[PDB]
Amino acid sequence: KGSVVIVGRINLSGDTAYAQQTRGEEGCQETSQTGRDKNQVEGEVQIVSTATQTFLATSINGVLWTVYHGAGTRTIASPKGPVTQMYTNVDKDLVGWQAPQGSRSLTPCTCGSSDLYLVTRHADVIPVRRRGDSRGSLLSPRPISYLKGSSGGPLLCPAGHAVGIFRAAVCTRGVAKAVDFIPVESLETTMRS
Amino acid sequence: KGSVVIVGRINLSGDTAYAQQTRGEEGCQETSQTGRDKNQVEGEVQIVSTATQTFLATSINGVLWTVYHGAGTRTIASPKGPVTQMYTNVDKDLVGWQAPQGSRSLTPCTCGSSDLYLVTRHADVIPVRRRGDSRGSLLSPRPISYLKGSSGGPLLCPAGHAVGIFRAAVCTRGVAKAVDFIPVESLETTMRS
Amino acid sequence: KGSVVIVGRINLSGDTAYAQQTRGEEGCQETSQTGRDKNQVEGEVQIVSTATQTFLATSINGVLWTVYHGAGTRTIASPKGPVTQMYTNVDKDLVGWQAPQGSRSLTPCTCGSSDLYLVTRHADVIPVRRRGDSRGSLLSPRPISYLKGSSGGPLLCPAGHAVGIFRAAVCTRGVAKAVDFIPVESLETTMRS
Amino acid sequence: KGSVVIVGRINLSGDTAYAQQTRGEEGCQETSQTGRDKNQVEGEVQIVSTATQTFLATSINGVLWTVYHGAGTRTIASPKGPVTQMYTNVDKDLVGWQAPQGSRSLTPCTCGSSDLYLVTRHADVIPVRRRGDSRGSLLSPRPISYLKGSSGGPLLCPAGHAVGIFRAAVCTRGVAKAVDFIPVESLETTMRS
Ligand SMILES: CC[C@@H]1C[C@H](C)CC/C=C\[C@@H]2C[C@@]2(C(=O)NS(=O)(=O)C2(C)CC2)NC(=O)[C@@H]2C[C@@H](Oc3nccc4cc(OC)c(F)cc34)CN2C(=O)[C@H]1NC(=O)OC(C)(C)C(F)(F)F
Ligand SMILES: CC[C@@H]1C[C@H](C)CC/C=C\[C@@H]2C[C@@]2(C(=O)NS(=O)(=O)C2(C)CC2)NC(=O)[C@@H]2C[C@@H](Oc3nccc4cc(OC)c(F)cc34)CN2C(=O)[C@H]1NC(=O)OC(C)(C)C(F)(F)F
Ligand SMILES: CC[C@@H]1C[C@H](C)CC/C=C\[C@@H]2C[C@@]2(C(=O)NS(=O)(=O)C2(C)CC2)NC(=O)[C@@H]2C[C@@H](Oc3nccc4cc(OC)c(F)cc34)CN2C(=O)[C@H]1NC(=O)OC(C)(C)C(F)(F)F
Ligand SMILES: CC[C@@H]1C[C@H](C)CC/C=C\[C@@H]2C[C@@]2(C(=O)NS(=O)(=O)C2(C)CC2)NC(=O)[C@@H]2C[C@@H](Oc3nccc4cc(OC)c(F)cc34)CN2C(=O)[C@H]1NC(=O)OC(C)(C)C(F)(F)F
Ligand SMILES: [Zn+2]
Ligand SMILES: [Zn+2]
Ligand SMILES: [Zn+2]
Ligand SMILES: [Zn+2]
């Protein structure tokens, strides 16, 4: 098994969020095996991939978090070679690596707001009403293709702070009505499992 | 000068560590003066307090260990009244009392692992790369307030064995970059100061 | 993508349940490629495999039912070539093919019993107390390895009727304490998705 | 929290250093509460005290410097009421107030001398060989009691110029073998923490 590769990024700093590709199919193949990635890293959300899957990863408090169902126990490619996981929990579906040099960490939310915004891999930032610790209902139901590939992405408060990590979607006939996420308070309190 | 009192504990059994409060400021002030504590004790990591300071204490091999800079020469409040220290060393900054009945002891690490996890008073479990015999660097540096009050707490290995006791932080720019700790092998080998 | 292949089965006819291997890693690869499998079929529960994963499949009312997270949109290998799916529902994590000739089908439960039994790929048939329509608690909590590769397997009532199809395990620190299943009343009522 | 109070001084003017007490426990307690101290100030090294601790404070370039581990963020009692700190750094363990009227400031050393002299609260002037920027070894090792209550005190060169402020002692078996100090070049260059 190879390393997880940063193949793009979601820029959240301007008036309009945008996704940008940094690596194609050809570039991602040898980067995965060597674990060496010389590409300059920028932003809060990275678009990441393995050999069979594409998903997101979010830098919060100097840690780049993602889902175990995407990254497995894999390292991530960096300029100084493959980077091992700081956090690994299969039961929570969570992994984390030291945030890459040049990345911009989101700050954890203490607002207690129920007005959330989910960031997708297509840079859509959509409202989610918080319905519990790890649940949120979408204000507008979406087809599965709209959310697929966006696990490991963040849930933000109206002030742009990180509230959680997108894990799973509540679905009915190819349509998502709610989301399941790992709350920010459950990140650095994670035990190895 | 009163006793050190157990005011809470860190629960390490789940996928998420959590802090539990067992006593408020009034009961801590009181129990500190009398040294009598009838409360059910559980787990490995205790949250402890004197009349003026709060820190951690860790059970390893039937001994509850902590820092001298926190506990001084003080007794520990217990069901049978104040319990005197079995280990006291000002130079090492270490103290220990017989572990409270019902407490669970961590087993010392026999891994040789250099991937450590520091447990804070806020139930944060942060990765530390073992650098020296008594040193480790944070994989992701943290503000002081994040590590403050966590002296006497444990440095665990990936398997959850004890590797050392948190003593001091290597701070620059109001940020802890590295930690200083008493290694497990240096605990039972302690002489009286 | 190739076909789903029967690689063995779970015989529940006698006093003691037993698993039998009928195909190996090479034969499974060749059968996945051709979609033609002339091997004899017998029993309720089939041990099935793709090129990368292995799980269970249960015949209920002439349909061989399994999980989408295992089978995907894949056809099943048969003596007359690749068999296309009759039920495909991503949201329910359910797939179904016409049961292969030689298979025995379970009958749906109408007993109303809350005393369930889950059948594993290792032929263990373990008690599960029903909590809701799709949930049950394990009477003995189990390591993840004990249940992994058993999705698509059945939940039985004390009279041996089909109660549901094992889908997911409620896990904490590598231990499953409860199970999530697709109830029998949710099988034939399934829509395409 | 009350004021840090001058409770005496070290006279370094004759052939033999001496310590003079100017206030007793009752006066220090009353002067700490009001923050008003009408007493005459003389010399370079003051004996200072809070409600609980006693230590030293040294005037260098019109600033009375001491350790944060003794003074904290506290004001100093003066003829015109409480005087606030102009220098406060937890990381360096340094504080500084405007030197009191009547104090005599030491001048920073520019000898480059490696032969230092540490001044204790008991007026002992003991040789220290400089080893690095912030370290010196004792020519004759000492019991801890000899050095305790002398943080904030000066390290002088053979010519009587200020080289550093005494911070910590390198201790083994109730004996100090070396000293850790804040160099004079690190005093005015101090940023707030
Ligand atoms: C069946 C409906 C859902 C799957 C759809 C096909 C996809 C929905 C779209 C996006 C989802 C965020 C999105 C995505 O984007 N993934 S991705 O980037 O594409 C991928 C595969 C890595 C490359 N996640 C999924 O598809 C996930 C993957 C799978 O669930 C899980 N697997 C493993 C461990 C989990 C642990 C959990 O709790 C501890 C847990 F809640 C779910 C776990 C399954 N999963 C889901 O999101 C599924 N929803 C789901 O399982 O929901 C439940 C039952 C957990 C619910 F309703 F309670 F939340
Ligand atoms: C100045 C920067 C540090 C203080 C910050 C204000 C706080 C850092 C946060 C947490 C530290 C673990 C934390 C905490 O949490 N404490 S607490 O629970 O709050 C408390 C006071 C009991 C109630 N410990 C400290 O703050 C400690 C206390 C003080 O150092 C020491 N005092 C006494 C004896 C020591 C003996 C030693 O070796 C033989 C030693 F290395 C340090 C000793 C001081 N101390 C420290 O941690 C300090 N770091 C420090 O002294 O570092 C050195 C110089 C020893 C280093 F860099 F080499 F490691
Ligand atoms: C995180 C802990 C669980 C994963 C462990 C690593 C393994 C547990 C062991 C056995 C589970 C039955 C076992 C197995 O055997 N699989 S297998 O045969 O090995 C395989 C991969 C096909 C070859 N299933 C899993 O591992 C499943 C796979 C994954 O969940 C799911 N993915 C896709 C769609 C799902 C739709 C759902 O509802 C509509 C749903 F509830 C779960 C879905 C993930 N999954 C799970 O069982 C996970 N539990 C889980 O997701 O549970 C929740 C959150 C739905 C719970 F707790 F609410 F039930
Ligand atoms: C464990 C041995 C030492 C404590 C002994 C019980 C006493 C030694 C005697 C005198 C020391 C100068 C004497 C004294 O006199 N103090 S006092 O006037 O009594 C007081 C408490 C204010 C009222 N200072 C101490 O006791 C000091 C206090 C404590 O260390 C420290 N706390 C806070 C911040 C520090 C920052 C540092 O660097 C960034 C640092 F190196 C040490 C820090 C702790 N401290 C020390 O001097 C301790 N030594 C120590 O921490 O040494 C190290 C590990 C930093 C060393 F060896 F590297 F220098
Ligand atoms: Zn917020
Ligand atoms: Zn270990
Ligand atoms: Zn029945
Ligand atoms: Zn000089």
PDB file of N, CA and C and ligand atoms in Angstrom, chain C residues 109-111 157 161, ligand 7:
ATOM      1  N   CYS C 109     -39.425 -14.915   9.103  1.00  0.00           N
ATOM      2  CA  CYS C 109     -39.929 -15.116  10.444  1.00  0.00           C
ATOM      3  C   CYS C 109     -41.242 -14.374  10.600  1.00  0.00           C
ATOM      4  N   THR C 110     -42.202 -15.018  11.283  1.00  0.00           N
ATOM      5  CA  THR C 110     -43.504 -14.440  11.641  1.00  0.00           C
ATOM      6  C   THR C 110     -43.791 -14.729  13.128  1.00  0.00           C
ATOM      7  N   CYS C 111     -42.755 -15.229  13.856  1.00  0.00           N
ATOM      8  CA  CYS C 111     -42.786 -15.615  15.273  1.00  0.00           C
ATOM      9  C   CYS C 111     -42.932 -14.432  16.205  1.00  0.00           C
ATOM     10  N   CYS C 157     -34.460 -16.442  14.016  1.00  0.00           N
ATOM     11  CA  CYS C 157     -35.291 -16.488  15.215  1.00  0.00           C
ATOM     12  C   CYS C 157     -35.007 -17.890  15.874  1.00  0.00           C
ATOM     13  N   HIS C 161     -36.159 -19.259  11.454  1.00  0.00           N
ATOM     14  CA  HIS C 161     -36.626 -18.444  10.321  1.00  0.00           C
ATOM     15  C   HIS C 161     -35.757 -17.181  10.179  1.00  0.00           C
TER      16      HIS C 161
HETATM   17 ZN    ZN E   7     -39.534 -16.916  13.781  1.00  0.00          ZN
END
